[PDB]
Amino acid sequence: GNGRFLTLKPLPDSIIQESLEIQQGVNPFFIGRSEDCNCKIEDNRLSRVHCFIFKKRHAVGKSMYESPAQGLDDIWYCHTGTNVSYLNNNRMIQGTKFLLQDGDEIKIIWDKNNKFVIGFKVEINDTTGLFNEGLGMLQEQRVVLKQTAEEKDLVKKL
Amino acid sequence: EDIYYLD
Incomplete structure (x- = not known):
């Protein structure tokens, strides 16, 4: 990885048609309206x-x-929005975390009446020594995890 | 300082 690792690209299916890339060097990568957010x-x-x-x-x-990958790195999607985001098929409320497997489509905002729908496609271009980049390691079947003060602190420095 | 609720 020369600078980019994960690619989050608001696809045409989403109200947004842009492409953002999470630099492996930046952790954690913040997304939102405020330019403060890496995205x-x-x-x-x-x-x-x-x-x-x-x-x-x-x-x-x-x-x-089970056969793990010794000890590599994985990407966790953290949601702090009050409007709750949707990852593929799992709910993402303010204060949740989810495993990001290469090719992960996340929904930032969806409105039935307003027809406001957002969604970014996560595409891992570079693998900085990832257990498997992100194919969806067994054991845990796509489940939404909860964040702690450690996570909230990450955004505090944002 | 936020009041969101998509329902």
Whole structure:
């Protein structure tokens, strides 16, 4: 990776038709209206910092039965927006985290009446020694995790 | 300082 690792590109299916790339060097990558966010997406519906993606070192206890990747890094999508975001098929409320597998489509905002729909396609171009870039490691079937003060602190420095 | 609710 020369600078880019993950590519979040607001696809045509979404009200936004732009492409943003999370530099492997920037952790965590903040997205939202405010330019402060590593990613620039301004939607009156979402907060200046609707959500941010944070990368963490993927690990596990033993390798009994299951075959892990020793100890590589994975990308976690953190949502801090009050309008709640949607990752593929999992709910993302203000204060949640989710595993990002190469080719992850995340919905920042969806309005049935307003027809306001946002969605970015995550595409890992470079693999900075990733357990498997992001194919959806077994064990945990796409489940939404919760964030702690550690996560909230990340945005505090934003 | 925010009042959002997409329902």
